[PDB]
Design a protein around this ligand. Structure first.
Ligand SMILES: Nc1ncnc2c1ncn2[C@@H]1O[C@H](COP(=O)(O)OP(=O)(O)OP(=O)(O)O)[C@@H](O)[C@H]1O
Ligand SMILES: Nc1ncnc2c1ncn2[C@@H]1O[C@H](COP(=O)(O)OP(=O)(O)OP(=O)(O)O)[C@@H](O)[C@H]1O
Ligand SMILES: [Mg+2]
Ligand SMILES: [Mg+2]
Lengths: 485, 434, 106
DNA sequence: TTTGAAAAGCAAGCATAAAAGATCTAAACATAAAATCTGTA
């Protein structure tokens, strides 16, 4: 038969369509799912990425410092206690509950929740509480937002079903199955804002299963914002999530110090056998070298990060960047390759902090050609003349022509007018646009300095500055020629 | 190690093609753009260059025949492996289906799978993918050309087959969208009138040799025949260059239309004197000649034109002709006439009832004779037909309800068409615009 | 030298070495012998020819390919667009301006 | 034969309806691999 179109790349998973409510003949016929081989969880790729080294690589003194500062809990004790007490009471009373946690990035939400469920699993290993199943659902790690329905049911039953069948199965399992035939499930919903669809059915279902009497379900919902339910969710879901919500504040600088010095307990103020032939250092031709990080360097890093964000990732990356700068300076002076006392002091931390804060924008427009800077200068002149923050391109063409023909006594303009309008030939006729007109316009568009409107008339098309006018004039004043006229 | 052909007024372009297109993949750019308008010899020069160098392996595609991006990807995947089959017939391959390519990354994957089975070749080779008319895709956006620019970076670096893209473009603005990519571009400017005349002689004289009309009239009444053909071409150019511009195709059309009638005025007296042949065949060098409703409906169209091009507040000053029992004054009319000629601009919008009032004001005619004409079934059927024939338009074009009082009406005919309509029923519409 | 002048012109306008490479490549390749290449790199006249070709389909070069009727119609439309306040025109007003200009010329 | 005088005409300024279209979505239309359902055997 003749097809109107073809779908030759369809890849369909092997997932059944029959839900759990039809799996048994009656409610009384459902067995103990805890005593089932495939229920409640009762790494095939990790050998793929291995090879032989055939080399002994050099690990300098700063390498152990840089590995100790990677993201891969002295300051989270009240939040740990609250989350642990709520989850513990819900587990050992066979209750269903929702624990809401919100915060800015890198303040330790995921780490605290994972340590809470680790200590809960340790409690259930010694029979202080009934045994439970732990499930992680990250909303940013799903292809489709409905795949969470597929994931949780697969973690509960071992079945592979499609998403509507999975959510029917989960609805039947939480609602109708008796408690004595079930197990407690703790579900971490990480990145909750990613699980928000147009119709909020996933959020309603996940928080409404926690209001079922038989469910034995605990949902730990981790969100960006305290008032995410009030901003983006319905009143029923906001009622079901609750009024009691746990805020993870940004870290103060004493806590960022505590985190960094907890990362630097075993190598800060310690000795190394350095082997100055290669620089490969071994922790206790060969010298005993003390390594230290300055406490005031950690102080200024922690103070800057705690004022700006309180992010632990940012503080660890700042200290790691400082160690990288010190290691680059160290390997420059010896030529150690990769195959006394060395200190990560204040200035490395300051150079690491300022390299994220210095702007390349003014440096970028400084090193442009004459024609691009002439474009920017004419656009600034038109912006101050007619007061508009949006200028027609034909006006910019006429302004460039006017600035060339008015400042015709300038020596640079005398030297460059023939280049700008004839490419210095006297065989090319006089042009209506300058040489490299479309080039510098497209260059300022790729850089994001300019915005242009989608019109096909070139003269009446408008152009806007996407950067600050003060930055543009500061760039234009650095040039010797354009600051004169 | 390449052969430069001789193209009559494209010598720089041919040297540029020789400088950019070679069998060595190391000294050949990944992308090459030929930019010029219609009839500038881009296809002719590229074809002459690839005919002068048969060792260069070229695949020709017309992006106008494919319309969209997905058939273009499938056409590339089809024609590349067909050319590779016909080029190395002893290499065993797998015939991948070109309809498997639905996305650009699928084209990258399919081209990789095709190219990894020609790895037994000796020397690195060039495959030239010529997209003649890239910006002639009916369905074109600004993001499509970026994919073809960066396509070579996703294909394997040390392959024996290295694809090279040659693009042909029409529009200067489309090319200037991509100026920061710094692709080598050869420009084909529009021809001179002298070059157009030379190309027309050298490409149409031999076609005017064996036309059966000329020889049939010589029998029925070789440098001399070339002389009369070239004189006809030069007369066509000198008569219609201001009409055609430097369009080769328009002058080809005019030559093809006017050659047989010019042939039919060649006599034995005319065959040696070209001025007498130009005097006898004169009327086809003066003009180009390149061309090819009921009573109620005509008056409804006339009334719609009147409604669209006259202001409604002057209506009672023109058509009102009935006597009065109650005291009253009609509209005085315009105090001074405007100088804008409103039939130069777009028509105004009017209601149905004003159109009916003006229609029965100007439609032709003891106690029950019913002198005026009411708007019965036939009037509304004719108006509906006029909307069907697109001689009347609305503001709404799709899902338009005729019956809403918020729906307005306008005429869309030119002034000449409504003049022909008004003079077909002997109506004097030009009085109303005086 | 002429090559330094072309480098200076690129530095003032494009400031792009790929742009200069796209002109240097056909200068090298179109030479047929060693002395011709030496004359080409000493004079850089091919760079002038290349620069002329890169602009030949611009607005300036497209106007120089127009016929007299085309130029007259374009001038008439530009007159009508200048007199308009939205810069807009149609075929009828441009033809009116054209016939007025032809009458006042003849 | 006149005659003031009210109906009608014109302009500037501004609030506002309407047109055009940019952007998007639902639904009809279309295909398709895996699961499931008959259905004799
Ligand atoms: N209290 C802490 N003690 C030690 N290390 C910490 C602490 N808080 C955060 N970190 C470090 O910072 C990293 C980021 O923490 P985490 O993943 O928990 O952040 P998060 O609050 O969930 O943020 P995001 O919203 O970006 O997901 C941790 O992996 C850990 O390395
Ligand atoms: N230099 C030339 N010498 C001889 N004949 C020529 C020359 N240039 C063009 N022609 C003739 O005119 C025809 C039109 O040229 P061609 O098809 O190459 O134009 P083009 O620029 O590719 O046009 P388009 O954009 O419409 O495809 C050619 O097929 C050929 O017959
Ligand atoms: Mg997290
Ligand atoms: Mg062509």
């Amino acid at each position: 038969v003749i097809r109107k179109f073809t779908k030759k790349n369809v890849a369909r998973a092997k997932k059944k369509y029959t839900p759990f409510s039809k799996r048994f003949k009656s409610i009384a016929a459902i067995p103990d799912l805890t005593s089932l081989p495939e229920f409640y969880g009762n790494s095939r790729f990790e050998n793929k990425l291995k090879t032989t080294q055939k080399h002994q690589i050099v690990e300098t003194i700063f390498s152990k410092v840089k590995k100790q500062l990677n993201s891969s809990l002295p300051a989270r004790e009240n939040e740990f206690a609250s989350i642990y007490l709520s989850a513990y009471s819900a587990i050992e009373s066979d209750s269903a509950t929702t624990i809401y946690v919100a915060g800015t990035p890198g303040v330790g939400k995921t780490l605290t929740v994972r340590e809470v469920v680790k200590e809960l699993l340790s409690s259930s290993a010694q029979r202080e509480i009934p045994d439970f199943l732990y499930v992680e659902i990250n909303g940013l790690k799903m292809v489709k937002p409905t795949d969470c329905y597929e994931t949780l049911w697969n973690k509960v039953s071992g079945e592979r079903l499609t998403w509507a069948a999975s959510m029917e199965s989960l609805e039947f399992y939480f609602k109708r199955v008796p408690k004595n035939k079930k197990k407690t499930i703790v579900v971490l919903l990480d990145e909750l804002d990613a699980m928000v669809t147009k119709s909020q059915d996933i959020m309603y279902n996940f928080f409404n299963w926690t209001t079922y009497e038989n469910a034995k379900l605990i949902v730990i919902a981790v969100a960006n914002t305290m008032d995410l339910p009030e901003r983006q969710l319905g009143n029923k879901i906001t009622s079901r999530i609750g009024f009691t919500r746990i805020m993870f504040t940004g870290y103060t600088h004493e806590e960022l110090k505590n985190i960094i010095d907890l990362r630097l307990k075993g190598l800060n103020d310690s000795f190394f056998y350095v082997d100055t032939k290669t620089g490969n250092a071994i922790l206790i031709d060969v010298r005993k070298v003390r390594l230290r990080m300055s406490a005031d360097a950690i102080e200024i890093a922690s103070r800057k990060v705690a004022s700006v964000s309180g992010d632990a990732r940012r503080a660890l990356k700042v200290c790691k960047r400082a160690a990288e700068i010190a290691e680059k300076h160290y390997m420059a002076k010896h030529g150690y390759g990769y195959d006394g006392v060395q200190t990560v002091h204040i200035t490395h931390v300051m150079k690491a902090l300022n390299e994220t804060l210095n702007s390349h924008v003014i440096t970028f427009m400084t090193r442009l050609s004459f024609t691009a800077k002439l474009f920017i200068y004419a656009l600034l002149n038109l912006m101050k003349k007619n007061g508009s923050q949006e200028q027609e391109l034909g006006d910019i063409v006429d302004e460039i022509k006017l600035l060339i023909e008015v400042n015709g006594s300038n020596k640079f303009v005398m030297e460059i007018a023939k280049t700008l309008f004839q490419q210095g030939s006297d065989n090319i006729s006089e042009q209506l646009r300058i040489i490299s007109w479309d080039f510098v316009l497209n260059q300022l568009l790729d850089a994001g300095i300019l915005f242009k409107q989608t019109m096909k008339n070139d003269r009446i098309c408008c152009v806007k500055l996407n950067i600050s006018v003060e930055e543009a004039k500061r760039a234009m004043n650095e040039d010797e020629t354009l600051r004169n006229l | 190690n390449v052969t430069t052909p001789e193209v009559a007024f494209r010598e720089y372009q041919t040297n540029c093609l020789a400088s950019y297109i070679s069998a060595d993949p190391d000294i050949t750019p990944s992308n090459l753009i030929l930019q010029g308008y219609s009839g500038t010899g881009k296809t002719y020069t590229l074809k002459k260059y690839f005919n002068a160098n048969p060792n260069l392996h070229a695949v020709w595609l017309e992006p106008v025949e494919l319309v969209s991006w997905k058939p273009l990807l499938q056409a590339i995947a089809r024609t590349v492996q067909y050319k590779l089959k016909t080029l190395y017939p002893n290499i065993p391959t797998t015939d991948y289906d070109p309809l498997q390519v639905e996305e650009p990354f699928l084209l990258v994957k399919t081209l990789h799978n095709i190219f990894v089975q020609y790895e037994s070749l000796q020397e690195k080779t060039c495959l030239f993918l010529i997209l003649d008319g890239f910006d002639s895709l009916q369905d074109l956006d600004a993001a499509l050309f970026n994919k073809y620019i960066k396509l070579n970076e996703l294909l394997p670096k040390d392959s024996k087959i290295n694809i090279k893209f040659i693009y042909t473009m029409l529009e200067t603005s489309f090319l200037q969208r991509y100026s920061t990519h710094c692709i080598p571009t050869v420009m084909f400017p529009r021809y001179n009138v002298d070059e157009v005349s030379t190309i027309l002689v050298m490409s149409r004289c031999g076609e005017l040799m064996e036309d059966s009309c000329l020889r049939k009239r010589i029998i029925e009444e070789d440098d001399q025949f070339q002389n009369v053909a070239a004189n006809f071409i030069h007369l066509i150019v000198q008569a219609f260059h201001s009409y055609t511009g430097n369009d080769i195709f328009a002058l080809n059309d005019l030559i093809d239309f006017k050659w047989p009638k010019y042939v039919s005025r060649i006599t034995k007296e005319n065959i040696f004197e070209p001025l007498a042949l130009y005097k006898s065949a004169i009327k086809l060098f003066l003009s180009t000649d390149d061309n090819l409703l009921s009573i109620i409906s005509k008056y409804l169209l006339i009334a719609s034109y009147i409604c669209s091009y006259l202001e409604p507040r002057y209506d009672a000053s023109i058509f009102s002709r009935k006597t009065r029992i109650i005291q009253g004054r009609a509209a005085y009319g315009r105090r001074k006439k405007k100088e804008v000629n409103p039939r130069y601009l777009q028509p105004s919008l009017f209601a149905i009832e004003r159109l009916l009032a003006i229609f029965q004001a100007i439609f032709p005619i003891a106690l029950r004779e019913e002198s005026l004409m009411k708007a019965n079934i036939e009037v509304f059927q004719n108006l509906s037909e006029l909307h069907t024939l697109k001689l009347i338009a609305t503001t709404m074009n799709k899902n338009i309800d005729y019956l809403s009082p918020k729906v307005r009406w306008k005429v869309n005919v030119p002034w000449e068409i409504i003049k022909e309509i008004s003079e077909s029923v002997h109506f004097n519409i030009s009085d109303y615009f005086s | 030298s002429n090559l330094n002048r072309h480098i200076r012109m690129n530095f003032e306008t494009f400031r792009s070495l790929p742009t200069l490479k796209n002109s240097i490549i056909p200068l090298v390749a179109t030479s047929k012998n060693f002395g011709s290449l030496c004359t080409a790199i000493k004079s850089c006249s091919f760079l002038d020819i290349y620069n002329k070709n890169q602009l030949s389909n611009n607005l300036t070069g497209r106007l120089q390919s127009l016929s007299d009727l085309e130029l007259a119609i374009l001038i008439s439309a530009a007159r009508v667009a200048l007199r308009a306040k939205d810069g807009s025109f149609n075929f009828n007003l441009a033809y009116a301006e054209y016939e007025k200009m032809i009458k006042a010329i003849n």
